[PDB]
Structure formats: C-alpha cells, structure tokens
Design a protein around this ligand. Structure first.
Ligand code: SF4
Ligand code: MG
Ligand code: MG
Ligand code: MG
Ligand code: MG
Ligand code: MG
Ligand code: MG
Ligand code: MG
Ligand code: MG
Ligand code: MG
Ligand code: MG
Ligand code: MG
Ligand code: MG
Ligand code: MG
Ligand code: MG
Ligand code: MG
Ligand code: MG
Ligand code: MG
Ligand code: MG
Ligand code: MG
Ligand code: MG
Ligand code: MG
Ligand code: MG
Ligand code: MG
Ligand code: MG
Ligand code: MG
Ligand code: MG
Ligand code: MG
Ligand code: MG
Ligand code: MG
Ligand code: MG
Ligand code: MG
Ligand code: MG
Ligand code: MG
Ligand code: MG
Ligand code: MG
Ligand code: MG
Ligand code: MG
Ligand code: MG
Ligand code: MG
Ligand code: MG
Ligand code: MG
Ligand code: MG
Ligand code: MG
Ligand code: MG
Ligand code: MG
Ligand code: MG
Ligand code: MG
Ligand code: MG
Ligand code: MG
Ligand code: MG
Ligand code: MG
Ligand code: MG
Ligand code: MG
Ligand code: MG
Ligand code: MG
Ligand code: MG
Ligand code: MG
Ligand code: MG
Ligand code: MG
Ligand code: MG
Ligand code: MG
Ligand code: MG
Ligand code: MG
Ligand code: MG
Ligand code: MG
Ligand code: MG
Ligand code: MG
Ligand code: MG
Ligand code: MG
Ligand code: MG
Ligand code: MG
Ligand code: MG
Ligand code: MG
Ligand code: MG
Ligand code: MG
Ligand code: MG
Ligand code: MG
Ligand code: MG
Ligand code: MG
Ligand code: MG
Ligand code: MG
Ligand code: MG
Ligand code: MG
Ligand code: MG
Ligand code: MG
Ligand code: MG
Lengths: 231, 208, 137, 148
RNA sequence: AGCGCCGGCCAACUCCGUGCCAGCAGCCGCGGUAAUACGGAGGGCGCGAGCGUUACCCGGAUUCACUGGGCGUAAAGGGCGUGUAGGCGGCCUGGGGCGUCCCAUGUGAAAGACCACGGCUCAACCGUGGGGGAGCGUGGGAUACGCUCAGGCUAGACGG
RNA sequence: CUGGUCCACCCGUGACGCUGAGGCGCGAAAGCGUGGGGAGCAAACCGGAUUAGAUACCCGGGUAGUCCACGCCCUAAACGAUGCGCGCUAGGUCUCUGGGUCUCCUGGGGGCCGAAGCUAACGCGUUAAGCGCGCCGCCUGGGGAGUACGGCCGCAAGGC
C-alpha cells in the first residue's frame, strides 16, 4: 500500500538546525539543506505500517497529534476519515498523564450539548445564554477530537516530535507507543515507529497521514481511498 | 540471682500469656484474662506507636523472661550461638532448651521452670545416675533425667507426675512415667517449640 | 600518554556510554590479548586489526541490550563497569589464593600471568596468579 | 496484599506575613515480602493525607528484586547524590544488617539475609532513593548471560 | 537486695513542692506560679550482689580515606616560569629472569586463639587431639606484565 | 636588538618524553636607598562645608609619592577564587588569526548556548567542573592566628 512519490513530495528540509541523532537517516546535504534517505524512509515506513495495521485489526485507537499550522487540518480530515481522535489546537498538558481530569472536561462539553436540547430550561438569564455558549464553542475548539477518546490510547501519531515534545513525553511515561513523522530537527530515539521525512510540507504531511489511514480503514473492512487533499 | 518478684506483671507487660505459674496460668483467675493491659498507673491508657528499639527490646525480654534467665547468662548463650556456624536463631533456642532446669520442666516433673529450678537446685534430680543440682547444665543427646530415687516418695513430684501420665512431651523428649525418668532425644527446632516469639528480632536487638 | 591499557578501557567506556557501534584504539599485542578476553566472554562483538591513516589500530565492536521502554529508551549496557586496577603509579599483583571474584561470579577480572592473559576463573583453574589488570561487568 | 511501612514523617514550613504555614511529607515503602517493593514520597497539608498519598506513588514505582534464598545475587554500591548505600549478599543465618531506612525496603522486598552500610550523607530521603536504585540494578546469572 | 534510669537520642508518667530560685546537664537543652527535664512521692523501665560514676584504649569516625575522602563558591591549586633529585613513561623483536607467579622443602617454640573430644556435678578453669597462615632460608619451574641489556620502528617529542 | 607562538611541506633525528621536593629567575601597586625630575593628580596636613557631631563622604589648598636611572622590597580579590601534560566523549552560533579546491572545508586562539556525563545546588560541559593515566602543590571544625617562639631573609617597613 506504500509508494515512492514521496520523492516528488518532500525528501526533507531544515538546513543545519539539525539533531546529530538524526544523522543515520540522512543521505547527504544539498544546497545547505539536509536531505533524507528515502530508502531509509521506505524501510521504516514498512516497519511503521506493519505496526499500524496490527493495531487497526485489533480495535486499537491512535490519537493523532498535530498542532503546527501546516498539519492542523490535514490531521483534522485524515483522523476524522478513520474516526480516530486528534488534537488540532493547543495540546493540553496531562491529556494522558492526567487523562481522567481532562476527561472530566468532555463530560462538561457533553452536558453542554444536552443543555442546548431546547429548552432544558434555556429560559435562563440571557447573560448566562451567551456565557455557556462561549464555554461551549471554547470547549469545542479544544476538545472536538479528544472527546472520541474515552480511555488511554494504544498508540499516538505525531507530525512534529520536536513541536509536540510534551505529547511524546506523556506517552512515554505511560508506555504508550509513539509513532511519528520527523525530519532532521527531531530526536529519533524518542519515537518508537519513525517516519523520517519532511514535516513542514503539506505535500509530505498529507501523503504520509492519508496513506496512514488508507491502512487503518482497509484493515477495519471496506477499502475506500479517495480522500480530500488541497492542491 | 534469678528474678523473684511478681510474675503476672511480666505477662501483662508483654501483652502475651507467658505460662510462668503452672496451673493458675490456665484458670480464669489468670491476670491476662482479667486485665490484659500493662501493669502500673497508666496500664489502661492508649499505647503510643513503639519504636523499633522498643519492639526489639520487648521480643528479647519475652524470650528471656520465659526461661526466667538472667540477662548475663542469656547474652552469653546468644554469643555462643552467634559464633557457632549455622543459623544463630535455631542454635540460640536449642541451647536455651538444653538447660537442665528447662528439661525438668518439659518432662513435667514441675509445673513451672521456677519450680524446676528449686527441684534441680535441691538435688531432687539426676542426670545419667549422677545427681546434678545445677540449673545451667547443658543436657546433651542421649542423656537421662530422672527423679532422685531418694526423693521419689515426694508429694509434689508424684502429683505432678500423675498429671503427666500418658501426657505427650515434645518430640525431642520421652518420659518413662511410673519410673520417674525421661530422656533427651535431640536438641529441638523452631517448629517443635512454638514460642510466642520472633527470635529473629532478638538477633537484630544485639546487632545494634 | 602514560597508560595505554587504561586509555583503552577508557576509550571503550566513553564509547559505550553514547552507544557507538565501534571505536578505534591504537593497536598492541598486549591489547589484543585483552580484547580477546572481552569478546570470548561476550563483553564485545569482537575486533579487527584496522589501519587509520597508515597507523596500526584495533576497531572494537560493542554490543548493548535491547531497546527499552518508558521515558528512557536507551538500552542497558553490556559493559556496565570496567576500570583499571594495577596502574603505572601502583602495581597490583595477587597470588592464586588471593585472586578476587568480580561481582560474586557474574564479573571477570583480567590478569596477566606467565601463562598469558587469563580471567580470574582461568587463572584459578591453572593455579597461577599475576598482575590484576582490570575488572569488567 | 501489599504491606506498607512509614519510614519518615516530617513537617516542613514556609514563611509569609502572618507567620509560618506547614506541610507534611511521608516516605512510605510498600511490598509483599516476595520480591516487589515500591517507594513513594507523599506530601500534603495534613499527616494522614500525605501518608495515604505516599502509598499511592509507592504502588506506581515498583521494582523487581531478584531474591535468591533470601539474599541478593551480587554486591552493589550506589551513589544517589551525596548518599551512598552498600549492599552485600549474606548467608542463611545472617539477618538484615541495616539502618532503619534501608532495612524497611529490604525487609518488605523479602530480603532475609544481607549486609549493608550507609556512607556519605545519611539523609533518609536520599538513602531510601539510593537503596531502590541499588535493588533496581541487581542482575542474575540469567540476565548476565542473556546479555552475552 | 540493691543500684541506675523514665524530655529527645533511649526502654520507662503521674501528683505535689519549687517559680530563671533551688537545682539538672553526655549533646541538644530544662527552670520566670498547671515543669513527663529541678526536689520528693506513687507508679514504671533496665540490670542484680551488684549498679552507677570518673579516667583511658579501639569502635561508631570513609573525621588522615591502602581497602576507603577531598581542593570553582563549603577547609583546600603553589602569584608565574625554569629546572635538580625523584616518581612516571610509545610501537615490534630477542637475551637475561630483578620484581611478579607456581611447586617442593626447612623455619614459623610453648602458652593463647580457633574446631572437636574429654576432666572438675555445670561453667569459669583445665587436659588431649586436629587445621593452617603470612614472613624469611634453600632447591626446581614459568615469562604475559613491570625491570634490565641488545636490535629495529615513527604515531609522542624534537629539528629542517 | 630580542622572546614566545601558529600554519603549510611531511624533509631530517628516532621515545630524545611527562611532571617536578629543593635550587634559580621573573613578579601589579604601595613602600625603601642614592641621584635626577616635578605639569597634572594627590596619602599626610590646612582650611570651607555637611551634620546632633563629621579626625570622613563634597569643596578650595597641599607634601611625600605618582615619572626616569640603578639597587632593594616579594605582597595581592597575584582570580578562571579552577596546577601541568596526554588520550577519549553530540552539536549550534559569534569572532581573531593561518592554510585550502575560498561556497565551504581544515589548523591554532577568544566567547556564548548546549549532547552524554558530572554537581549539594548554583552551575561545568572538546578552553570540563565529563571519562581515564602520570606527577606536583594543598585541605582535615570556628576563634585564638597568619599571632607567639625558633630559624632564614630584608636598610627598614616587614616577608617566608
Ligand atoms: S496467671 Fe496468666 S499472667 Fe499470671 S503468670 Fe500465669 S499466664 Fe502469666
Ligand atoms: Mg519541523
Ligand atoms: Mg508453655
Ligand atoms: Mg552465624
Ligand atoms: Mg510440641
Ligand atoms: Mg513451644
Ligand atoms: Mg556488634
Ligand atoms: Mg585498589
Ligand atoms: Mg518526586
Ligand atoms: Mg545525598
Ligand atoms: Mg559524591
Ligand atoms: Mg552469594
Ligand atoms: Mg556526611
Ligand atoms: Mg545527621
Ligand atoms: Mg530483574
Ligand atoms: Mg541506666
Ligand atoms: Mg519542656
Ligand atoms: Mg541505652
Ligand atoms: Mg520512651
Ligand atoms: Mg525556695
Ligand atoms: Mg509558666
Ligand atoms: Mg507544679
Ligand atoms: Mg532526665
Ligand atoms: Mg521528677
Ligand atoms: Mg554473678
Ligand atoms: Mg564497675
Ligand atoms: Mg573514639
Ligand atoms: Mg579510621
Ligand atoms: Mg585513597
Ligand atoms: Mg571530605
Ligand atoms: Mg574560602
Ligand atoms: Mg593559578
Ligand atoms: Mg612565593
Ligand atoms: Mg614500559
Ligand atoms: Mg623509568
Ligand atoms: Mg624477553
Ligand atoms: Mg624483555
Ligand atoms: Mg625474577
Ligand atoms: Mg611456608
Ligand atoms: Mg603456635
Ligand atoms: Mg566435661
Ligand atoms: Mg591446644
Ligand atoms: Mg587465620
Ligand atoms: Mg624462591
Ligand atoms: Mg631501543
Ligand atoms: Mg610526529
Ligand atoms: Mg615541527
Ligand atoms: Mg619524514
Ligand atoms: Mg632511520
Ligand atoms: Mg616543567
Ligand atoms: Mg621551587
Ligand atoms: Mg615588585
Ligand atoms: Mg611602584
Ligand atoms: Mg617609595
Ligand atoms: Mg617614609
Ligand atoms: Mg624613590
Ligand atoms: Mg635615610
Ligand atoms: Mg579637614
Ligand atoms: Mg565635635
Ligand atoms: Mg563644624
Ligand atoms: Mg575636611
Ligand atoms: Mg581635596
Ligand atoms: Mg589640588
Ligand atoms: Mg607635590
Ligand atoms: Mg612623608
Ligand atoms: Mg622621601
Ligand atoms: Mg625600579
Ligand atoms: Mg579576574
Ligand atoms: Mg589561565
Ligand atoms: Mg589563593
Ligand atoms: Mg587535580
Ligand atoms: Mg583566507
Ligand atoms: Mg592567549
Ligand atoms: Mg575552538
Ligand atoms: Mg555554558
Ligand atoms: Mg542532560
Ligand atoms: Mg568526580
Ligand atoms: Mg568530537
Ligand atoms: Mg564547542
Ligand atoms: Mg585554551
Ligand atoms: Mg568540582
Ligand atoms: Mg604543580
Ligand atoms: Mg582551630
Ligand atoms: Mg601578612
Ligand atoms: Mg609573620
Ligand atoms: Mg619573629
Ligand atoms: Mg603565601
């Protein structure tokens, strides 16, 4: 289910703000820019997906993590495709290490849904109407993807392991496997199932995230691939 | 010499029945049944969490007061057991039980070790035909502890031996009743002697 | 450079602590016999006589435990501990009866005897002592 | 069922206008006397809360002690900060020769016979930490051969 | 049957008397009118023909650190060179065998110590038997390491 | 007139090396001796203020000295409060100075941030306070005290 049009999509970037532990996944440097070893990406993408498919064929959830403005909608769509929880806005410290407490926040979002089941006395003071409505949109902005997750996930998928260092830190303290896309600025050894490749090009993020869910849906029955991908 | 004063206060202090009197130890007028709290003005006040030093001192005072033995002789026996190769806990109890005044009590010649000592000290005991009036004698395997035949017509020893008729003694012993003689089979075990005592806590008290 | 034997043990220690696959120590026959013991006892994958810019070296191939799980994935070392015992500033020689047992058997003491470089078990099985070179676990 | 022992309960203090306001900390070890121990340090505005809170972390930080006839496999030395603990295997009739802090951890992990020595700073907190890390690095002939 | 002790370390708590006094104290500290800390008492703890105190030795003191410590700010880098003695020293080969290692052998008195048995009713005490050690003398052996002597090398160092 | 040091070539010598108790030399300022010099500054000193007072801070004066030669003195927050040499253990960035094939790379310096690791923490981190070897110096509770006595040095002050 793999490919090789990654070559037409990324082969990395980010000059020499690099991490020496990311050396073994580099081929050479072009015009003052590090270039990833796409063959190493291939052999890793093989190993990476071999784990992903086994988690799809067992009912495991994968909490997708992407907050950088590049992967913020790509992660919204492709994670909604498989109906897997995401986090697109601010990542909240304790979303794993303090999960019960952040989950106490969706129950509020939950009951704020059923409160706007009119009336349920929505004959409250109007200053209270736009107030709870605010808290609703507010909770909506940050929990619209986390609510689907109602237990500790079985793995997480991150587009920038340097940007989402806190999520990686939380998942590791909970022995939860970490899979991620990563270019040169990232610590390889902190990820468990790596995808060495550009994490700033939407071309690369879309290609890897969509092919990620292309396995997820095909391993839960019903291989259907044509997914949105902004030109 | 040995301790002579009130012995019920010892049990009441240790929070456990130490069978130091014989048959009143089994009556309902045993002090532990009526007042199972420490002696003195503050016996009935709520205890405080004892220190680890307290805990270990108490277990050692239990094991000691049980045999009515001086701290001096108690500590020398412990130091003997401690040099001896092998587990010190076993050997310690083994040496304790190997005291003549203790065996005489185990054979049921006397109701209490105190009584045994006044028996032994008064020569009313023999070992392998040899009269021995020493409570400290280390009885060895194969010995034979009889009543002094020139004392075998004595009320206390007869009434005591009457209640021993058919009564079991420890595995490590054997009692020829009617003939008023017993035999030391081998030195006993922690299993044979279920003493209300964790003797390991006594190793720790002396290592401090 | 005053102690090539301790420099090599130190070359190995600095290398294993940052999980390098190999490191080069300048070669010598007395070192080969020492590494010969580390490979045969499994503290290293082995070595080979290589050549760095025309100079005779030894390339030592390290081995580590499996990747670990949790906050620190770094795998457990196979050489936890290696240090020089006898040194130029103080020689250390033991007889066979006073050879030590490193780590209650789970470790090796490397000796130089007049039967060559041996372990504490080998030296005890040959009834010879010698210079206590180092200890590994 | 896990046994717990309180090693340390101390009251600390912070200042402010008005005077000092207190806080309590409990060093608590937890174990089954079979090869599992945990150490947690719990801190709360009252003693019982902090003690219970301590047992919580204690269960969240366990260590597997390769017990061998009641003693540890090999000798080990560990330095946690300026505190140093020494643990040395010991034969059947030995006992647990240790200060109050290392004793409670070894005892609850099912260590019947060991020789120990505290060196350096004898701060009960740092010594307790140093004793855990020493147990955590104990390895067996199995583990050693498995690695080579 | 006596002696010490009962604030914490450290095992054992109450009443009175005193009121920064009289006094206690190994250290930290107690005492200024409700003192578990002074004095007595009752009670308790610990030992027992002993119990305490004083002095001194080793231990706790890895606090002179060989095992087994340190020196940016805690005590601790010499104000800086230069260099004498000394300590230490790279790669390969061979000779010697000084250190080093092994084997044999002599010495390592008796008592004591240690394991066992035995004798004084037990023990203390004492008797009998057993096991060695280092260290040094001698003989034989080994040669990796250090040493020494000889030869070679260029990675250190030094010159062009 | 003269020292140190770096680079490139990889040409010469063949371990000729590291450290270094003592010794020897150098050693800011102030101070000393003989003799010069003396504008500015400025201990001591004189005066004006300030102030409760003001043997100070501020102001107006002012002699040593500050400067030169020669000879002494030998101290310091003489500091990176961090002895010297070597090997080893991610990088990023700024800069000085060489050599390149001049983007860049590679030597030698000077900084900043940081890998692993270290540290009581602060912090250190290829310019280590990391990991090791060699050698030197030094510490061992505060005060008494860098004092006293002895010795050695100095013209003295005073130094070790
Ligand atoms: S009567 Fe009870 S308290 Fe008294 S000595 Fe006998 S067992 Fe102990
Ligand atoms: Mg990026
Ligand atoms: Mg009984
Ligand atoms: Mg023993
Ligand atoms: Mg029985
Ligand atoms: Mg019993
Ligand atoms: Mg002792
Ligand atoms: Mg040593
Ligand atoms: Mg914590
Ligand atoms: Mg510490
Ligand atoms: Mg330390
Ligand atoms: Mg063992
Ligand atoms: Mg200390
Ligand atoms: Mg202390
Ligand atoms: Mg284990
Ligand atoms: Mg006393
Ligand atoms: Mg008080
Ligand atoms: Mg005491
Ligand atoms: Mg008490
Ligand atoms: Mg008065
Ligand atoms: Mg008052
Ligand atoms: Mg009063
Ligand atoms: Mg007192
Ligand atoms: Mg009183
Ligand atoms: Mg006596
Ligand atoms: Mg006396
Ligand atoms: Mg002393
Ligand atoms: Mg000492
Ligand atoms: Mg030392
Ligand atoms: Mg120190
Ligand atoms: Mg200082
Ligand atoms: Mg200096
Ligand atoms: Mg000087
Ligand atoms: Mg040499
Ligand atoms: Mg030499
Ligand atoms: Mg030779
Ligand atoms: Mg030779
Ligand atoms: Mg020789
Ligand atoms: Mg001999
Ligand atoms: Mg002799
Ligand atoms: Mg006899
Ligand atoms: Mg004898
Ligand atoms: Mg001996
Ligand atoms: Mg000889
Ligand atoms: Mg030569
Ligand atoms: Mg050269
Ligand atoms: Mg040159
Ligand atoms: Mg040349
Ligand atoms: Mg030549
Ligand atoms: Mg020099
Ligand atoms: Mg000098
Ligand atoms: Mg000068
Ligand atoms: Mg001057
Ligand atoms: Mg002058
Ligand atoms: Mg003058
Ligand atoms: Mg002058
Ligand atoms: Mg004059
Ligand atoms: Mg004036
Ligand atoms: Mg005036
Ligand atoms: Mg005036
Ligand atoms: Mg004035
Ligand atoms: Mg003026
Ligand atoms: Mg002027
Ligand atoms: Mg002038
Ligand atoms: Mg003058
Ligand atoms: Mg003058
Ligand atoms: Mg001059
Ligand atoms: Mg400075
Ligand atoms: Mg400098
Ligand atoms: Mg200084
Ligand atoms: Mg140093
Ligand atoms: Mg240039
Ligand atoms: Mg310079
Ligand atoms: Mg540089
Ligand atoms: Mg820095
Ligand atoms: Mg770090
Ligand atoms: Mg260190
Ligand atoms: Mg490097
Ligand atoms: Mg750098
Ligand atoms: Mg430098
Ligand atoms: Mg330091
Ligand atoms: Mg020096
Ligand atoms: Mg002093
Ligand atoms: Mg001075
Ligand atoms: Mg002076
Ligand atoms: Mg003088
Ligand atoms: Mg000085």
């Amino acid at each position: 289910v793999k490919e090789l049009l990654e070559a037409g999509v990324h082969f990395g970037h980010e000059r020499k703000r690099w991490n020496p532990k990311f050396a073994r996944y580099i081929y050479a440097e072009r015009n003052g820019i590090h270039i990833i070893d796409l063959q190493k990406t291939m052999e890793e993408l093989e190993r990476t997906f071999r784990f992903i498919e086994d988690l799809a064929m067992r009912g495991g959830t994968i909490l997708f993590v992407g907050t950088k403005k590049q992967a913020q909608d790509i992660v919204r769509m492709e994670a909604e495709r498989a109906g897997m929880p995401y986090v697109n806005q601010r990542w909240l410290g304790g979303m794993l290490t303090n999960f019960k407490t952040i989950s106490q926040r969706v129950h509020r979002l939950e009951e704020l849904e059923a409160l706007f089941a009119s009336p349920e006395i929505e004959e409250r003071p109007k200053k209270e109407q736009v107030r709870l409505k605010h808290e609703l949109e507010r909770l909506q902005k940050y929990l619209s993807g986390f609510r689907l997750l109602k237990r500790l996930p079985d793995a997480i998928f991150v587009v920038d392991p340097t940007k989402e260092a806190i999520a990686v830190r939380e998942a590791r303290k909970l022995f939860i496997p970490v899979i991620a896309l990563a270019d040169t600025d990232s610590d390889p050894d902190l990820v468990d199932y790596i995808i060495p490749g550009n994490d700033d090009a939407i071309r690369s993020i879309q290609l890897i995230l969509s092919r990620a869910v292309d396995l997820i849906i095909q391993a839960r029955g019903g291989v259907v691939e044509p997914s949105p991908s902004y030109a | 010499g040995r301790y002579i004063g009130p012995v019920c206060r010892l049990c009441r202090r240790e929070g456990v029945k130490l069978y130091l009197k014989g048959e009143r130890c089994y009556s309902p007028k045993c002090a532990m049944e009526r007042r199972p709290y420490p002696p003195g003005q503050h016996g009935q006040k709520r205890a405080r969490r004892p220190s680890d030093y307290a805990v270990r001192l108490r277990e050692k005072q239990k094991l000691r007061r049980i045999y009515g033995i001086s701290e001096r002789q108690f500590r020398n026996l412990f130091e003997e057991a401690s040099k001896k190769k092998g587990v010190t806990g076993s050997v310690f109890l083994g040496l304790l039980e190997s005291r003549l005044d203790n065996v005489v009590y185990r054979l049921g010649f006397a109701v209490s070790r105190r009584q045994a000592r006044q028996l032994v000290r008064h020569g009313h005991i023999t070992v392998n035909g040899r009269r021995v009036d020493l409570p400290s004698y280390r009885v060895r395997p194969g010995d034979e502890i009889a009543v002094a035949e020139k004392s075998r017509n004595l009320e206390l020893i007869r009434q005591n031996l009457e209640a021993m008729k058919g009564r079991k003694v420890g595995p490590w012993l054997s009692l020829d009743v009617e003939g008023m003689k017993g035999k030391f089979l081998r030195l006993p075990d922690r299993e044979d002697l279920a003493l209300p005592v964790n003797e390991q806590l006594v190793i720790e008290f002396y290592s401090r | 450079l005053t102690d090539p034997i301790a420099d090599m043990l130190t070359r190995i220690r600095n290398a294993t602590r940052v999980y390098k696959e190999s490191t080069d120590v300048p070669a010598s026959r007395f070192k080969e016999e020492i590494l010969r013991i580390l490979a045969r006892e499994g503290f290293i994958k082995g070595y080979e006589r290589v050549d760095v810019d025309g100079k005779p070296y030894l390339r030592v191939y390290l081995k580590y435990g499996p990747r670990r799980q949790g906050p620190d994935p770094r795998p457990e070392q196979v050489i936890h501990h290696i240090r020089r015992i006898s040194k130029p500033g103080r020689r250390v020689y033991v007889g066979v009866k006073e050879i030590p047992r490193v780590r209650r058997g789970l470790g090796i003491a490397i000796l130089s005897t007049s039967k060559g470089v041996l372990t504490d078990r080998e030296a005890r099985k040959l009834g010879v002592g010698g210079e206590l070179i180092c200890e590994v676990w | 069922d896990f046994e717990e022992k309180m090693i340390l309960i101390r009251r600390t203090a912070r200042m402010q206008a008005g005077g000092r306001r207190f806080r309590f900390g409990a060093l608590v070890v937890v174990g089954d006397r079979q090869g599992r121990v945990g150490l947690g340090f719990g801190k709360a505005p009252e003693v019982p809360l902090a003690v219970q809170k301590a047992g919580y972390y204690a269960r969240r930080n366990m260590v597997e002690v390769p017990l061998q006839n009641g003693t540890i496999p090999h000798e080990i030395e560990v330095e946690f900060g300026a505190s140093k603990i020494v643990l040395k295997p010991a034969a059947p009739g030995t006992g647990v020769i240790a200060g109050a802090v290392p004793r409670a951890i070894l005892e609850l992990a099912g260590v019947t016979d060991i020789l120990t020595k505290e060196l350096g700073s004898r701060n009960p907190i740092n010594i307790a930490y140093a004793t855990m890390e020493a147990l955590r690095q104990l390895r067996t002939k199995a583990d050693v051969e498995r690695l080579r």
